[PDB]
Amino acid sequence: RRICRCICGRGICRCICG
């Protein structure tokens, strides 16, 4: 939608964009 807080690295990864 407009807010995006995707974080990913050497193990953890979660995209919160919309």
Side-chain angles (χ1 to χ4, degrees):
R1 184 60 179 177
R2 184 59 184 289
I3 176 176
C4 300
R5 288 289 76 186
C6 306
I7 309 295
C8 296
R10 192 193 172 294
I12 305 300
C13 187
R14 185 63 185 181
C15 204
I16 308 296
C17 185

